[PDB]
From Swiss-Prot:
Composed of an N-terminal active core containing the motor domain (MD) and a neck coil (NC), a central regulatory center required for dimerization and activation and containing the FHA domain and coiled coils (CC1 and CC2), and a cargo-recognition region containing a coiled coil (CC3), an undefined region (UDR) and the C-terminal PH domain. ATP binds at residues 95-98, 203. Belongs to the TRAFAC class myosin-kinesin ATPase superfamily. Kinesin family. Unc-104 subfamily. It is found in: Cytoplasm, Cytoskeleton; Cell projection, Axon; Cytoplasm, Perinuclear region; Synapse. This is Kinesin-like protein KIF1A. Dimeric motor; dimerization is required for ATP-driven processive motility. Monomer in vitro. Interacts with PPFIA1 and PPFIA4. Interacts with CALM1; the interaction is increased in presence of calcium and increases neuronal dense core vesicles motility. Interacts with PPFIA2 and TANC2; both interactions allow the recruitment of neuronal dense core vesicles to dendritic spines and decrease in presence of calcium. Interacts with SYT4 (unphosphorylated) and SYT11; both interactions increase in presence of calcium. Interacts with MADD. Mg(2+) binds at residue 97. ADP binds at residues 60, 93-98. Expressed almost exclusively in neuronal tissues such as brain and spinal cord (at protein level). Expressed at lower levels in the adrenal gland (at protein level). It comes from Mus musculus (Mouse). Kinesin motor with a plus-end-directed microtubule motor activity, required for anterograde axonal transport of synaptic vesicle precursors. Also required for neuronal dense core vesicles (DCVs) transport to the dendritic spines and axons. The interaction calcium-dependent with CALM1 increases vesicle motility and interaction with the scaffolding proteins PPFIA2 and TANC2 recruits DCVs to synaptic sites.
Length: 321
């Protein structure tokens, strides 16, 4: 797996913009009529999430759905070790926040909230007297190559993304604290999401919600616990590139995709330092550790270029490991 796209019914700016929809299969239809042409195409897109109507519409991409499809499977791999990713990419107002952290009230949740929950349930259901996992998580915002401990509001004893000669990239301490208890964990997020509030320009940033699943198996053959960790990173990178303000953020990443998108002739040295964001995630992005994506589109015809822009180099995610 690795890719999917999701469209949002309509937002105010749209609702009053007397703008209807262009995006109507398993693939994305994309028209424009304000040029003539019929194109572009539909593109593969493992998943072309249809959520244009109302959660009452039988034909509706339910929240629980997107999870049981991308997240669920993505959580499974974790148990069997192997790290994983899930980025919500977009165009400001595309639907990234919802599809990752939705809304607190019953129903309207993201994959994050559901994923942990699963994890948590996954762990307490138990089955054997030697589990021992312990949940370790962190919530950072990457703004102008300038992280921020959404977990610990006043941070401290920090700087940027440092590289551990062997353990891989990380950051100066930051904030890392177990808790074990969905509710305990659930809370963390909350506090976090709030740590950011300047239109909310919290957009020119990207929030990484990474968790450290450590697995300790008991031998039952010459006592010998076995440390089996997995890294679970879900991000909501910036979106939409009138284009007041720039910064590596995008590009950095904008560079990686061209990379993982470049095999030719049957089946590398990988270029991501040049991509601070990719930095944060080594193996999980450069070979090893499966990875899936979610793009959120806007039904508005007033947004046919940016969105379309999204579809294309979304379709582009087809080549690497
Ligand atoms: N599939 C969906 N179902 C219901 N509401 C949605 C959906 N997708 C987006 N939204 C709406 O859009 C808003 C959030 O979009 P958002 O994730 O914040 O944008 P972005 O992350 O691209 O900046 C919410 O207030 C929500 O009502
Ligand atoms: Mg947002």
């Amino acid at each position: 797996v690795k890719v999917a796209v999701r469209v949002r019914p309509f937002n105010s700016r749209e609702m009053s913009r007397d703008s209807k929809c262009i995006i109507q299969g398993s693939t994305t239809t994309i028209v424009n009529p304000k040029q003539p042409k019929e194109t572009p195409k539909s593109f593969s897109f493992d998943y072309s999430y249809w959520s244009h109507t109302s959660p009452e519409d039988i034909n509706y991409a339910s929240q629980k759905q997107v999870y049981r499809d991308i997240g669920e499977e993505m959580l499974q791999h974790a148990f069997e070790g192997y790290n994983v990713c899930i980025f919500a990419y977009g165009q400001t107002g595309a639907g990234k926040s919802y599809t990752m952290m939705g809304k607190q009230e019953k129903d309207q949740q993201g994959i994050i909230p559901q994923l942990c929950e699963d994890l948590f349930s996954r762990i307490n259901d138990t089955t054997n007297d030697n589990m021992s996992y312990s949940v370790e998580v962190s919530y950072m915002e990457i703004y102008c190559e300038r992280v921020r401990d959404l977990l610990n509001p006043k941070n401290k004893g920090n700087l940027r993304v440092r590289e551990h000669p062997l353990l891989g990239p990380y950051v100066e301490d930051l904030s890392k604290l177990a808790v074990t208890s969905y509710n305990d964990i659930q809370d963390l997020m909350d506090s976090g999401n709030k740590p950011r509030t300047v239109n909310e320009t919290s957009s020119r940033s990207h929030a990484v919600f990474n968790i450290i699943f450590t697995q300790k198996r008991h031998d039952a053959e010459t006592n010998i616990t076995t440390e089996k960790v997995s890294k679970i990173s879900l991000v909501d990178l910036a979106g939409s590139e009138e284009g007041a303000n720039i910064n590596k953020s995008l590009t950095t990443l904008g560079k990686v995709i061209s990379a993982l998108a470049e095999m030719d002739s049957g089946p590398d040295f990988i270029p991501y330092r040049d991509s601070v964001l990719t930095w944060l995630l080594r193996e999980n992005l450069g070979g090893n550790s499966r990875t899936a994506m979610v793009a959120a589109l806007s039904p508005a015809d007033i947004n046919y270029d940016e969105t379309l822009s999204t579809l294309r180099y979304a379709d582009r995610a087809k080549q690497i490991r």
